[PDB]
Amino acid sequence: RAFGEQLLKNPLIEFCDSVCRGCGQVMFQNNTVTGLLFFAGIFYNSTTLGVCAVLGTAASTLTAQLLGVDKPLVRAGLFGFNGTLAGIALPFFFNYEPAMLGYVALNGAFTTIIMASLLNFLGKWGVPALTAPFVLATWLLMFGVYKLSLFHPGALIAPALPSVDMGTVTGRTFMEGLFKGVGEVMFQDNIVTGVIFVVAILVNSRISALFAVIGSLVGLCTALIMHSPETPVRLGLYGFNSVLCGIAMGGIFFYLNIRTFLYALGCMVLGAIATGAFSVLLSPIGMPALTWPFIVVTWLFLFAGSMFRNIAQVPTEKAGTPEDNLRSLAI
Amino acid sequence: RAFGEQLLKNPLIEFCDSVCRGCGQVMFQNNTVTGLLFFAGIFYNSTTLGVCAVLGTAASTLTAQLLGVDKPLVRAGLFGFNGTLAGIALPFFFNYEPAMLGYVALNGAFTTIIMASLLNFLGKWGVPALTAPFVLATWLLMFGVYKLSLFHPGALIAPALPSVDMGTVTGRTFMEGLFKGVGEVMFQDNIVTGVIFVVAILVNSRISALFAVIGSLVGLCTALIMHSPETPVRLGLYGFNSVLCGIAMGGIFFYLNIRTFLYALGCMVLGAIATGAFSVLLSPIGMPALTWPFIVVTWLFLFAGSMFRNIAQVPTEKAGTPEDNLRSLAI
Amino acid sequence: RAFGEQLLKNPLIEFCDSVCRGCGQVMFQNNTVTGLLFFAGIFYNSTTLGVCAVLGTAASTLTAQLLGVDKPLVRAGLFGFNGTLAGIALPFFFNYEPAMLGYVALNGAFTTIIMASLLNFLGKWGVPALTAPFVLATWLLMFGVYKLSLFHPGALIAPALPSVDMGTVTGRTFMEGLFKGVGEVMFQDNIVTGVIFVVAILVNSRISALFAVIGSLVGLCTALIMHSPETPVRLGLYGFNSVLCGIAMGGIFFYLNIRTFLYALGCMVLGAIATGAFSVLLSPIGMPALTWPFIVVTWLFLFAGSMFRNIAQVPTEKAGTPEDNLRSLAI
Numbered sequence: 001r002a003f004g005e006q007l008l009k010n011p012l013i014e015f016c017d018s019v020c021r022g023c024g025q026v027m028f029q030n031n032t033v034t035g036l037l038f039f040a041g042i043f044y045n046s047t048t049l050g051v052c053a054v055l056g057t058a059a060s061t062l063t064a065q066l067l068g069v070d071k072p073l074v075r076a077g078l079f080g081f082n083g084t085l086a087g088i089a090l091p092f093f094f095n096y097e098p099a100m101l102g103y104v105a106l107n108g109a110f111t112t113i114i115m116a117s118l119l120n121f122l123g124k125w126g127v128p129a130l131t132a133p134f135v136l137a138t139w140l141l142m143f144g145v146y147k148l149s150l151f152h153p154g155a156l157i158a159p160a161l162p163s164v165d166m167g168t169v170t171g172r173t174f175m176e177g178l179f180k181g182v183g184e185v186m187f188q189d190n191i192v193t194g195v196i197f198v199v200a201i202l203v204n205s206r207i208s209a210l211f212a213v214i215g216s217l218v219g220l221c222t223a224l225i226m227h228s229p230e231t232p233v234r235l236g237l238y239g240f241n242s243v244l245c246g247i248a249m250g251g252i253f254f255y256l257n258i259r260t261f262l263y264a265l266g267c268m269v270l271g272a273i274a275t276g277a278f279s280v281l282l283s284p285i286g287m288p289a290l291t292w293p294f295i296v297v298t299w300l301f302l303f304a305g306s307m308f309r310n311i312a313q314v315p316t317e318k319a320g321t322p323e324d325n326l327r328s329l330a331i
Numbered sequence: 332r333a334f335g336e337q338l339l340k341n342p343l344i345e346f347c348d349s350v351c352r353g354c355g356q357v358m359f360q361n362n363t364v365t366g367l368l369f370f371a372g373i374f375y376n377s378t379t380l381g382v383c384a385v386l387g388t389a390a391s392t393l394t395a396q397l398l399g400v401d402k403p404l405v406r407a408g409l410f411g412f413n414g415t416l417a418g419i420a421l422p423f424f425f426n427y428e429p430a431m432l433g434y435v436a437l438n439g440a441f442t443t444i445i446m447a448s449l450l451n452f453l454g455k456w457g458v459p460a461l462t463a464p465f466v467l468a469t470w471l472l473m474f475g476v477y478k479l480s481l482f483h484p485g486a487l488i489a490p491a492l493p494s495v496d497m498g499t500v501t502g503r504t505f506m507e508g509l510f511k512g513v514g515e516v517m518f519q520d521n522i523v524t525g526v527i528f529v530v531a532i533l534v535n536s537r538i539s540a541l542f543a544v545i546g547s548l549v550g551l552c553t554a555l556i557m558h559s560p561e562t563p564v565r566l567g568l569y570g571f572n573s574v575l576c577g578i579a580m581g582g583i584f585f586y587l588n589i590r591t592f593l594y595a596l597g598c599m600v601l602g603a604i605a606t607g608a609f610s611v612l613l614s615p616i617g618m619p620a621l622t623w624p625f626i627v628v629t630w631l632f633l634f635a636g637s638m639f640r641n642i643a644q645v646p647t648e649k650a651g652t653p654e655d656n657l658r659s660l661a662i
Numbered sequence: 663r664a665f666g667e668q669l670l671k672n673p674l675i676e677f678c679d680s681v682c683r684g685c686g687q688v689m690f691q692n693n694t695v696t697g698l699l700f701f702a703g704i705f706y707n708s709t710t711l712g713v714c715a716v717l718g719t720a721a722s723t724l725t726a727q728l729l730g731v732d733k734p735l736v737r738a739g740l741f742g743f744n745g746t747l748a749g750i751a752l753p754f755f756f757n758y759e760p761a762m763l764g765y766v767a768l769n770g771a772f773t774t775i776i777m778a779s780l781l782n783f784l785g786k787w788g789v790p791a792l793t794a795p796f797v798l799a800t801w802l803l804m805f806g807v808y809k810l811s812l813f814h815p816g817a818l819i820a821p822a823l824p825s826v827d828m829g830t831v832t833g834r835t836f837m838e839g840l841f842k843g844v845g846e847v848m849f850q851d852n853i854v855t856g857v858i859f860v861v862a863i864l865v866n867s868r869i870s871a872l873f874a875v876i877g878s879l880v881g882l883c884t885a886l887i888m889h890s891p892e893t894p895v896r897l898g899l900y901g902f903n904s905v906l907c908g909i910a911m912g913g914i915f916f917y918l919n920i921r922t923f924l925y926a927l928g929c930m931v932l933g934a935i936a937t938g939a940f941s942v943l944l945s946p947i948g949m950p951a952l953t954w955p956f957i958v959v960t961w962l963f964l965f966a967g968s969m970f971r972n973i974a975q976v977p978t979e980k981a982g983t984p985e986d987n988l989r990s991l992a993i
């Protein structure tokens with residue numbers, strides 16, 4: 001890309017580009033068009049969620065600039081993706097109140113703190129923060145809803161002690177399950193949004209698009225093998241963590257080969273199992289696990305990589321697309 | 332201070348001074364008179380809680396000396412403050428049994444282990460342990476009360492699944508809320524104790540006394556903005572975490588300026604929100620969050636500081652009063 | 663041992679030796695005969711649990727070799743012991759289904775990931791992973807049982823909010839409590855299995871055998887002092903965490919003397935108290951704490967050791983039997 005295009009830059013267009021890469025990075029895709037198309041998929045499903053994704057991405061990005069995060073970290077969208085999710089999560093789980101937008105901005109800003117926390121903390125081992133800033137901030141802003149009534153929880157939020165119908169697996173289970181598994185990465189209960197999302201990843205990386213598809217499928221059929229009722233599976237609730245596992249493990253943080261593929265398959269399966277685990281863990285307070293399943297399991301596999309000679313890890317500060325990763329190895 | 336006064340020292344008066352600085356350090360005040368006045372505020376509210384604060388401070392300090400902690404860490408009260416709290420927490424939440432004093436000594440001694448754990452662990456990033464030793468030890472000694480009946484929980488301890496009256500905000504809400512917010516840092520449901528506490532901090536640092544006041548107010552009105560019932564707010568239950576946030580962030584661990592002030596305001600607000608969050612999280616087992624809200628949120632902001640160019644952190648091994656901090660910067 | 667015996671080695675006998683040391687290491691005993699005798703104790707109680715211990719040890723060991731863990735870590739059984747436990751835990755808590763063996767192999771394989779994670783993570787402070795890989799993997803594979811019905815929980819698994827009969831202490835309380843405390847380290851509700859286990863440790867280390875006995879007793883009487891009902895105490899449910907505390911602290915990770923003995927006694931008592939704590943913490947979801955009590959408390963004491971001049975820690979990469987440890991100090 002012509003170095004002279006830098007004469008054309010202005011803080012507003014540069015901020016706008018940081019924001020769209022921010023959104024791309026929700027699925028590890030450092031690409032403006034990918035992020036632009038993620039926004040398109042969300043806006044396709046809901047205008048309200050779309051505006052809130054944008055505001056959350058904008059809130060977190062701006063906060064990072066206000067505090068003076070290193071320019072390259074901001075330019076790569078690493079202070080945007082947790083803000084995208086922080087923005088969608090709130091109106092997904094809670095009913096609208098006028099304060100909703102203020103609260104989204106707050107949740108966005110808070111993710112930026114936690115991203116910096118975790119880059120400082122996890123950086124000693126070269127391990128990425130993933131979506132932990134989004135999960136930890138949103139939990140902190142959501143758990144207290146029963147005591148702090150500004151917002152009112154939706155019907156998805158229902159405290160209960162866990163206990164042990166099953167439904168019927170059909171072709172629909174698989175087609176809906178697949179693409180909603182991708183869509184549910186950003187709380188998008190929408191087959192077409194999921195398709196758009198896969199296309200969006202394809203633009204930046206073909207291998208990462210395939211692993212998104214594989215992850216969703218592995219999560220889905222893991223849950224079926226494990227005798228989940230059909231309804232959650234069809235809704236892609238067992239795909240989205242495994243989607244993220246697939247993309248992270250499938251050539252981004254490890255060099256793609258047969259061994260690292262098997263390793264990736266490990267994360268993906270356990271991501272789906274951890275989804276049932278964390279959902280149960282938080283059920284007494286009625287709260288969603290979000291992407292905690294993907295975070296915990298992928299952190300375990302990431303931390304473990306340097307101990308396994310047969311598993312070629314990519315150095316995190318270098319880690320680009322699976323295609324780029326292979327091309328720098330062969331060099 | 333005349334170096335010859337060292338000829339006058341004796342292990343008992345030196346231990347006594349370690350203990351009073353220990354108590355001062357509950358609110359980051361490395362000052363014997365501050366600690367002496369904290370004791371005075373507690374004894375003003377309750378003789379039983381006062382003796383137990385002293386015994387807990389004494390138990391933790393002595394254990395540190397028995398194990399051979401570095402003299403300067405002990406001399407600065409860093410092995411006392413968690414013991415002060417460990418001592419008060421037990422008779423605050425549980426009914427009296429003769430064993431109570433033994434258990435306080437045990438809780439005090441345990442905090443010293445955990446302080447050393449966390450200084451070793453968190454020390455790699457220059458992050459302070461705060462009151463995590465007190466919280467983790469007390470949780471470990473309290474959670475098991477339903478299975479181990481030596482002690483009997485008070486009526487504040489009542490397992491329930493969370494669920495969604497509101498009361499009436501008055502002038503009393505604000506005056507009681509303010510000073511009980513300070514008092515509740517040490518479980519002191521007492522307006523005058525809170526005043527005494529603010530005076531005690533003022534003796535060592537004017538800026539830290541103001542931030543104690545600001546923290547309590549920010550916590551209070553955050554909870555009101557968030558539609559908390561009035562009763563918890565009036566009782567200062569939403570101030571005390573934010574008091575600690577305010578003091579830590581307001582010039583002690585960051586150099587006081589407009590940007591670090593805004594940063595501090597961030598911790599304080601989120602400290603109050605995290606108070607609702609952690610209270611809900613532990614409600615199925617009926618247990619108090621203690622200062623976990625302040626610990627988690629302040630840890631996040633502390634870990635994040637080195638990533639933010641616009642936020643001037645003080646090196647922790649140097650960090651004194653906000654006044655001293657400014658005076659060494661200008662040098 | 664004659665260096666020429668190396669000519670006789672074959673991958674299958676070497677794997678077999680890795681597996682038996684793996685089992686020995688459940689109680690820190692790097693000894694093939696110790697592990698062989700642990701297997702004997704289990705098979706004495708239950709053939710089904712014995713086969714499953716072996717399969718879990720085999721699954722974790724093989725996975726480590728497949729991924730290329732450093733040979734000496736594997737040769738020392740450090741990638742076996744969490745697999746032993748991962749294997750027993752599943753049929754102890756859940757009813758049989760044909761998939762049980764597949765799931766055990768999965769749990770075994772997962773422990774190996776987490777062991778590597780934690781050796782990388784905790785290695786920066788020279789702190790051992792202990793049985794955290796077993797606990798974290800098994801929790802992840804167990805918690806989700808209410809949502810993923812392949813397996814069906816046994817009657818030990820019963821979600822309830824905690825609440826506040828007492829039974830009668832007799833000689834039986836003490837004899838059964840003692841040896842089941844040892845036996846319950848590996849989920850063996852069997853006095854003779856516990857005896858066998860103590861003998862097995864004695865083969866490798868007399869001091870570690872005594873600390874196993876002391877730990878079990880300290881845990882037992884701590885729980886009685888704390889007014890536990892008699893039934894859990896008799897069943898050794900308050901010994902097994904303290905057994906592990908005793909062995910770890912009694913000369914393995916610290917050089918055995920009077921001060922480190924008192925230190926060890928600290929871990930052991932708090933291990934029993936933490937057992938009530940974590941049992942309550944997980945009761946809303948009906949889940950066992952496993953050895954989390956021992957892990958948390960022993961981690962605290964381990965991390966704290968380098969801060970205490972009066973407490974002589976052994977460097978972890980050197981740490982052998984208490985007897986060997988003393989013999990290298992005197993050199």
Ligand SMILES: [Au+]
Pocket residue numbers: 015016017019020
């Ligand atoms: Au944009």
Ligand SMILES: [Au+]
Pocket residue numbers: 016017
């Ligand atoms: Au734009």
Ligand SMILES: [Au+]
Pocket residue numbers: 013016017020032
């Ligand atoms: Au743009």
Ligand SMILES: [Au+]
Pocket residue numbers: 028029030319320
């Ligand atoms: Au990336």
Ligand SMILES: [Au+]
Pocket residue numbers: 016017020032033035036
């Ligand atoms: Au764009």
Ligand SMILES: [Au+]
Pocket residue numbers: 048049051052101
């Ligand atoms: Au919106």
Ligand SMILES: [Au+]
Pocket residue numbers: 048049052091100101
């Ligand atoms: Au919205």
Ligand SMILES: [Au+]
Pocket residue numbers: 220221222224225
């Ligand atoms: Au399937």
Ligand SMILES: [Au+]
Pocket residue numbers: 221
């Ligand atoms: Au399948």
Ligand SMILES: [Au+]
Pocket residue numbers: 346347348350351
């Ligand atoms: Au004193």
Ligand SMILES: [Au+]
Pocket residue numbers: 347348
């Ligand atoms: Au004194």
Ligand SMILES: [Au+]
Pocket residue numbers: 344347348351363
């Ligand atoms: Au004194």
Ligand SMILES: [Au+]
Pocket residue numbers: 359360361650651
């Ligand atoms: Au200080």
Ligand SMILES: [Au+]
Pocket residue numbers: 347348351363364366367
């Ligand atoms: Au004093």
Ligand SMILES: [Au+]
Pocket residue numbers: 379380382383432
């Ligand atoms: Au007392």
Ligand SMILES: [Au+]
Pocket residue numbers: 379380383422431432
């Ligand atoms: Au007392």
